[PDB]
Ligand binder design. Structure first.
Ligand SMILES: CSc1ccc(C[C@H](C)C(=O)O)cc1Nc1nc(N2CC[C@H](N(C)C)C2)cc(C(F)F)c1C#N
Ligand SMILES: CSc1ccc(C[C@H](C)C(=O)O)cc1Nc1nc(N2CC[C@H](N(C)C)C2)cc(C(F)F)c1C#N
Lengths: 301, 296
């Protein structure tokens, strides 16, 4: 249907079906046990961020590879259940959409994951070149196939050079997995989200150390953001002033799966509304902190 | 009197085949993954249809994506689903099964969605004339005993040729299910129930539990690689060696393949010894294959 100009937030990245089962004790091999609870939860970083952007009230769209099948049918219906637009999905003619079986032991919180990843072709620069960029106000890219994603980012920059400052598309990039191929993406985007895992892999022990050590990698003008679980989150911009927000921990922590995605989506949402980087950091910690006290994304607003 | 009805459970099995069983708190990538229709009575319908027997499934299901996959899979195998007790609310049960490719072991994490089971009221609406054999998977014994009493009432006013043969499966070691031993012409008792009651072999289990079955009944007990045994009114213990595949890859549903194959062979007029051997033959072939494709 008709999407108004410069209204949607696009998240380019991964999607996975997690069939999560909570059990009294980890099952012994060749045995049948009944789980305490079970939920089929749609995952993936860009996918979870779309869920949160929709609940926060922002029109959003997901762009990622999916192959026709039972897993894709469940995931598409789950995207629609959360009000996410899926018209940009790169549908692959062969393969399986990723899915996993996660067993969580209630006795000690241990989590055993049996992942089924058929190495499905990622979204390419050719696929992204067919996307009409006018319907988007913000494009968030989850670091995955950096060499192709750099061409996607160069296409958005070309679009912005011939647009007034009001109609320019804001860009954010997430370097979450500690893969050396992804570190070229630091030099792209207006906002760069770096994970605690990437920071620790590169020898940084805190958000302050990570932002001071990695700011030289971002392009001129960019804001580098780093969330650090119970230690809150920090941001660093061109003025060189480190910004910080304390965490807003829930009374009881029940589920941190997707807390980083809730933080990213909430920082994007607040900045796309014209709020300052300090205000967006606080909002991101506030929404991600509330999410940690809830199972899934229901009730974050 | 042409169809074989299986009353029991249907679940969606999300099966992951792995090189070795994963250690707790680890992340492993499986060799392959598939959505397969499961449940004891449901798997028996799959095998009865592949063996060439008209069959029907009776079990609780709730509308949704899981039920749509399961109904399409039942129709794909030529299984009649007009007897399904459709519930207005809930989700059809589902499970995560990890199958070790090195030895065919299967670990099941079952999610029973507390969906209402098939009741004696639901079964009372079933026209029994179109069935020649009715197999009931032990689940809600108090209600299933009323279903079994209804079939007995039907048989009392039928000539011996038009009587419906009945089989019962006591698979889970639940004390409430042991009342079902005294019902049916064939009673299938699992190795788990036998070991729970202190029996160390199929011979011990059949001698120790035959007093629980009704007069005339045949008690059957499969014992994985040790074959299977049966005991009838004549008191003669019958045995069949297993037909193990050279490489065991998937034992999920081997017991269901055994039960369906023993029912199929007996419904064709074969002896209890012939049915025991056929059950071991088809279940043994299934252990060397992923799923039920290729068992015939
Ligand atoms: C600033 S919001 C944020 C942003 C990204 C992340 C995820 C990322 C992986 C990371 O930074 O670790 C997390 C959060 N936030 C929390 N994460 C938590 N954990 C994460 C795993 C830890 N284990 C299980 C010991 C616990 C606990 C809390 C707690 F205070 F309620 C909060 C909050 N509030
Ligand atoms: C007599 S046929 C039969 C009838 C009922 C069952 C019961 C079982 C619980 C099931 O339903 O899987 C199993 C079988 N048969 C086999 N089971 C095997 N298991 C290895 C360990 C597995 N554990 C207990 C789950 C089971 C291995 C083999 C091997 F020789 F190939 C065969 C055969 N033949």
């Amino acid at each position: 249907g008709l999407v108004p100009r410069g209204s949607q937030i696009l998240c380019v990245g991964l999607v996975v079906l997690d069939v999560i089962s909570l059990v009294d004790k980890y099952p012994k091999e060749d045995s049948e046990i009944r789980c305490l609870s079970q939920r089929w939860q749609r995952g993936g970083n860009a996918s979870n961020s779309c869920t949160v952007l929709s609940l926060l009230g922002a029109p959003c769209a997901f762009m990622g590879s999916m192959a026709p099948g039972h897993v894709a049918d469940f995931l598409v219906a789950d995207f629609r259940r959360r009000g996410v637009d899926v018209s940009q999905v790169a549908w692959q003619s062969k393969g399986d959409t990723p899915s996993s079986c996660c067993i969580i032991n209630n006795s000690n919180g241990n989590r055993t994951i049996v992942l089924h990843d058929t190495s499905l072709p990622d979204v390419s620069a050719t696929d992204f070149e067919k996307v009409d960029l006018t319907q988007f106000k913000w494009i968030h890219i989850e670091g995955r196939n950096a060499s192709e994603q750099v061409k996607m980012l160069q296409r958005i920059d070309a679009h912005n050079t011939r647009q007034p400052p009001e109609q320019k598309i804001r860009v954010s990039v997430e370097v979450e997995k500690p893969r050396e191929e992804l570190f070229q993406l630091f030099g792209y985007g207006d906002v760069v989200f770096v994970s605690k895992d990437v920071a620790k892999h590169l020898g940084f022990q805190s958000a302050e150390e990570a932002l001071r050590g990695l700011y030289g990698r971002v392009r001129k003008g960019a804001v580098l953001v780093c969330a650090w679980a119970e230690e809150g989150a920090d941001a660093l911009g061109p003025d060189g002033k480190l910004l910080h927000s304390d965490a807003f921990p829930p009374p009881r922590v029940v589920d941190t799966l997707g807390a980083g995605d809730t933080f990213n989506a909430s920082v994007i949402f607040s900045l796309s509304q014209g709020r300052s980087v300090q205000e967006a950091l606080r909002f991101g910690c506030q929404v991600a902190g509330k999410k940690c006290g809830l199972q899934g994304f229901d009730g974050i607003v």
